[PDB]
């Protein structure tokens, strides 16, 4: 996505606008930063070579400006009812604020734009979409204290995001549906902590960088395209596909750690039924992760024989192999970590 320096300019201004959003002490400067982030994320997610990217940017524009005007209208309504930004007893205007934030984030009652837009993108604007663009709404969700909207969103996110990814054989829509399920674990962590959410979001972001770099360097967009992917040693293809088992939450790899910290903090906060509802609905996520892992866990395949050289970037794959090592051997660093406490 670095074909121009103007895209680097749009990247730093969308970083600036997101930081204006998450540091605003009022409900209107947050909307100001949301509009800055929207202005800088319209030209990214748009390109001349791909036809679907322009209508996907149209879908993003209509979804975000529908969500931002409802966010502005409800914040002005809250300010008209009580003139401070906070609220003593929570009421329906906070529900409209949280629903407008859930349309921005992509919770499962309002998530239907997310994989339908994801069906026509590249793998770097998807990396910006499921990681950085989830910063601006989710950090405003932590300011509200209503429980049942978060409960409905978490439950609907972990059933709908896990079941709906089974039919999808495109890798982008499957990763969007997997990010919808990993969104629900972040909102379940938001009801109990503002630090365990940062733990889950940072390592989910880390897993998103290391897993979307596999599909961006080698240009993989399909489940059948993974079977035809040529790696010179099949042990390396087997080892590189352990990031799916890592992100699915398996104990020897990293990615078990943030889910485990969410489990540890939720049980200490006496919330057991919602945890069971999420973890019976996270096995389906590992099922469509293991359906990807059909293409590497067996050691020999009926490969197409016209391609015999593996072509790859140098700097991007050099950054990829550092993060693949810490995705599967990163549980040795739990003794050095001190940010859980």
């Amino acid at each position: 996505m670095f074909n121009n320096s103007s895209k680097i300019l749009f990247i730093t201004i969308m970083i600036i606008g997101t930081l204006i959003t998450v540091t605003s002490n009022s409900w209107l400067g947050a909307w100001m930063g949301l509009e800055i982030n929207l202005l800088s994320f319209i030209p990214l997610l748009s390109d001349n070579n791909n036809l679907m990217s322009t209508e996907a940017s149209l879908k993003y524009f209509l979804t975000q400006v529908l969500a931002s005007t409802v966010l502005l209208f409800s914040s002005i309504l809250l300010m008209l009812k009580n003139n401070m930004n906070n609220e003593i007893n929570e009421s329906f205007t906070s529900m409209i604020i949280m629903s407008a934030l859930l349309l921005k984030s992509g919770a499962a009652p309002f998530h239907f734009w997310f994989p339908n837009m994801m069906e026509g993108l590249t793998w770097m604007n998807a990396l910006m979409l499921m990681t950085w663009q989830k910063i601006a709404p989710l950090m405003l969700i932590s300011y509200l204290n209503i429980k049942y909207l978060l409960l409905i969103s978490v439950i609907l996110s972990v059933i709908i995001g896990a079941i709906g990814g089974l039919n999808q054989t495109s890798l982008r829509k499957l990763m969007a549906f997997s990010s919808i399920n990993h969104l629900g674990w972040m909102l379940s962590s938001l009801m109990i902590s503002e630090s365990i959410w940062l733990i889950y979001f940072f390592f989910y972001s880390f897993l998103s960088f290391v897993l979307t770099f596999m599909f961006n360097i080698f240009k993989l967009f399909h489940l059948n395209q993974l079977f035809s992917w040529f790696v010179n040693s099949k042990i390396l293809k087997f080892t590189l596909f352990m990031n799916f088992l890592s992100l699915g939450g398996l104990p020897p790899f990293l990615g078990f750690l943030p889910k485990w910290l969410v489990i540890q903090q939720l049980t200490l906060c006496n919330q057991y039924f919602m945890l069971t509802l999420m973890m019976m609905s996270t096995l389906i996520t590992l099922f469509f992760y293991l359906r990807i892992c059909y293409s590497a866990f067996m050691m020999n395949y009926f490969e197409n024989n016209w391609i015999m050289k593996m072509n790859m970037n140098s700097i991007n794959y050099n950054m990829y192999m550092i993060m693949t090592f810490f995705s599967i051997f990163g549980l040795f660093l739990i003794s050095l970590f001190y940010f859980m406490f």
């Binding site: 509009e35 929207l38 202005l39 319209i42 748009s46 322009t54 149209l58 524009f61 400006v65």
Partner: peptide, 13 residues
């Protein structure tokens, strides 16, 4: 700026 952005999205098709 949102309205000009939406018009420039719409006429780019």
């Amino acid at each position: 700026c949102e309205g000009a952005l939406g018009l420039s999205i719409l006429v780019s098709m």
